[PDB]
Amino acid sequence: RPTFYRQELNKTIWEVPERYQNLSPVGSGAYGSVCAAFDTKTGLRVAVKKLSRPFQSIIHAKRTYRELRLLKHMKHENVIGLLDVFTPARSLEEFNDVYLVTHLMGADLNNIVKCQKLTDDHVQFLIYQILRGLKYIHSADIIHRDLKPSNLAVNEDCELKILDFGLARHTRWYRAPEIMLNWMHYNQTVDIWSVGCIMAELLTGRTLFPGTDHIDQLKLILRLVGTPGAELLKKISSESARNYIQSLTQMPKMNFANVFIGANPLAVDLLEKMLVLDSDKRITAAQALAHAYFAQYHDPDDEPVADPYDQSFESRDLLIDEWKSLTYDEVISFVPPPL
Numbered sequence: 001r002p003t004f005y006r007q008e009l010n011k012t013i014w015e016v017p018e019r020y021q022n023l024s025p026v027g028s029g030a031y032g033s034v035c036a037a038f039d040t041k042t043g044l045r046v047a048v049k050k051l052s053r054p055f056q057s058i059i060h061a062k063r064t065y066r067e068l069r070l071l072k073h074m075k076h077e078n079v080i081g082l083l084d085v086f087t088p089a090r091s092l093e094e095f096n097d098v099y100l101v102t103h104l105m106g107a108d109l110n111n112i113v114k115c116q117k118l119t120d121d122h123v124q125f126l127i128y129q130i131l132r133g134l135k136y137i138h139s140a141d142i143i144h145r146d147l148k149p150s151n152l153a154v155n156e157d158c159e160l161k162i163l164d165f166g167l168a169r170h171t172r173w174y175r176a177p178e179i180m181l182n183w184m185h186y187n188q189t190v191d192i193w194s195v196g197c198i199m200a201e202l203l204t205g206r207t208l209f210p211g212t213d214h215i216d217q218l219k220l221i222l223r224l225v226g227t228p229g230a231e232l233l234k235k236i237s238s239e240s241a242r243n244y245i246q247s248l249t250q251m252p253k254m255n256f257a258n259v260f261i262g263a264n265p266l267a268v269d270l271l272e273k274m275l276v277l278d279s280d281k282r283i284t285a286a287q288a289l290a291h292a293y294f295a296q297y298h299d300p301d302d303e304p305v306a307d308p309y310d311q312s313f314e315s316r317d318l319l320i321d322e323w324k325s326l327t328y329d330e331v332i333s334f335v336p337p338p339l
């Protein structure tokens with residue numbers, strides 16, 4: 001147990017140990033507020049997330065537990081890790097606050113692309129790194145479901161980290177069409193759609209699909225991928241959507257050569273295999289890595305798959321004290337990473 005201290009940061013109380021020096025609200029992080037802090041027992045520049053009412057609800061309680069378990073398992077370079085997990089709690093019948101810690105990067109891929117367009121080598125390193133992150137996440141049977149530049153954290157030396165994974169359920173701009181229109185059974189390839197919306201954007205400095213609603217967004221989608229054909233229009237079941245498509249203007253597929261003008265031929269080819277409207281035809285994270293474009297970066301011997309990750313709790317219906325105890329048990333039981 002360490003020396004604690006109580007401070008305030010923009011209308012909220014922040015109870016954090018002696019070691020966590022200098023704090024500052026850097027931006028909007030999933031579930032609660034995040035702070036930029038400077039460590040001591042390691043002495044680095046970290047990010048600290050204070051969860052918003054983590055146990056106030058059955059949703060919040062099942063989502064507090066979920067995250068703490070994803071980060072206690074994710075040991076891969078381009079995947080967000082867990083440096084520390086703390087509470088000001090003396091007991092379990094007190095424990096109603098949770099804070100998780102990990103390194104702070106330079107900027108996110110959204111603030112990177114704003115200033116400005118990135119060459120055919122920056123892109124090679126960034127997409128490779130995104131997908132190599134995805135491959136580790138995926139083999140542990142987790143999908144992202146909300147992959148977009150803002151959750152893709154990067155360093156000055158271009159080294160990448162994926163954020164806010166495995167939490168999403170129930171940005172649309174990088175969201176897969178089948179998960180947005182409820183067309184098919186769906187799989188881990190909804191993020192493979194996201195990377196092609198990201199890739200293309202680092203290659204043009206232009207949001208591929210800056211649509212306005214579920215209707216405008218999709219109209220922007222076909223406006224590039226061509227209306228579902230004879231192979232696809234059979235597969236879709238969704239009575240509303242299945243009847244909705246055949247009532248749109250007949251559009252052809254565009255040439256990704258005549259869209260991404262000047263682009264390295266292999267980028268055009270991989271993009272094509274990314275914006276496929278067939279969730280079963282579409283390429284996978286591991287498949288995408290063995291593509292000629294990543295010839296120089298790719299080495300299957302340094303692209304690892306994850307240690308088995310237990311999701312048995314994900315179908316479970318438990319009470320708040322049950323969850324609040326499971327998380328408490330995981331908070332107290334965590335052991336720092338080895339240097």
Ligand SMILES: CCCNC(=O)c1cn2ncnc(Nc3cc(C(=O)NC4CC4)ccc3C)c2c1C
Binds near residue numbers: 030048162
């Ligand atoms: C200087 C601009 C760049 N800033 C960053 O590097 C950076 C921004 N953020 N924003 C939110 N959470 C972070 N970290 C974080 C991420 C998760 C996370 O990704 N959750 C996984 C979904 C289960 C959980 C807790 C925390 C503190 C984080 C980091 C590191």
